[PDB]
Symmetry: D2
Subunit: 114 residues, 4 copies
């Protein structure tokens, strides 16, 4: 099934943050309405927050997270969770190898902000 | 119901990161095995990371997050999500006022690391 | 924080199912647009389905689950999870006692339907 | 990534419930310790509960959900969510066609019981 794609409320600012846990250099692309809006990269086996940024969901509210290592797309897992019908978390995990820990690149999207 | 309490596998490394979205300075205490193991303090209304660290779950694996603003405990909401039966997210949202956006202090705990 | 309240897309069909795990008779009230749309009542300590039905979120899409035992409101825990950005689960757990297993009345709301 | 596989605490009773929302007959298999422990088959576009039973996780605690339509395996999506660090939901969605709603056969596993 498709993973890493989330529908946020339109024209809403959200935070996107990436974590690295791999010996390979991670590259995270965040697309809004099918267009890259932010890219983060880094190499850490100690959960370094390789990047964070505030984006606007735009008119479509469509957000997609892509993870690649040296140009090679990683296998993704994701889900969205809503707490007290207000706080939203869109989560993504990724595997760039076969040890299957799926934390090589971890991305958390949260909203609302402010 | 109790919130902000998670049972992680014992003696395991996990990451804890806090984001702030409030006019008030957020104080995030992380207790492991019933003893404070880390504390983050910061202020932001733009989802800035006010702290991130790697900790160990201790002998019981019990990890608790508490949030307060100038001594006043914030109401918490939380949940744990597991993807592909191995990637874990312990999530916490908190409210320091009455607008109930529960993002004043957002905390993400993730494991495994490395 | 408020629990058991979910905002579904307006005028959408959804399923609601209640399970019981308590010595006490569980009374589950499902409100739509702040009005009772269905009530399930039964007793079971073996996860028996005390009710399942197809409802409509109505104009507002506001859905709320209330659980009471002998008239006394049970404490609730809840969250919404969305898989592959299409499959939604509105989950509710309730506690009518002190053992805090929060399964005394378990309610699962799912959409979209077929 | 692998989906529909869950690790529950060993020798623990859990509930497994399947809903149907497809034009095709859904075949849901629940394997405990790599052995078929329950099977539900049915057709419904209105969330009929085609099956709900209480099973024991066995010595391994490994539980797997498989869904097929007339011998053809459906693609699965899944996740586990834990509320108040006590109530567990193992969620599964399945897709038999081309409308990516993954609600053709929906399975919910919950524990603890009683
Ligand atoms: Ca890996
Ligand atoms: Ca890794
Ligand atoms: Ca607030
Ligand atoms: Ca706020
Ligand atoms: Ca109870
Ligand atoms: Ca109970
Ligand atoms: Ca379908
Ligand atoms: Ca369907």
């Amino acid at each position: 099934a498709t993973q890493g794609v989330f529908t946020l409320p339109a024209n809403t600012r959200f935070g996107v943050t990436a974590f690295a846990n791999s010996s390979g250099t991670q590259t995270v692309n965040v697309l809004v309405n099918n267009e890259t809006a932010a890219t983060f990269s880094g190499q850490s086996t100690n959960n370094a927050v390789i990047g964070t940024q505030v984006l606007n969901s735009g008119s479509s509210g469509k957000v997609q997270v892509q993870v690649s290592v040296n140009g090679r797309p990683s296998d993704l897992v994701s889900a969205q969770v809503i707490l007290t019908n207000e706080l939203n978390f869109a989560l993504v995990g990724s595997e760039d190898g076969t040890d299957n820990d799926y934390n090589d690149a971890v991305v958390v999207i949260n909203w609302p902000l402010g």
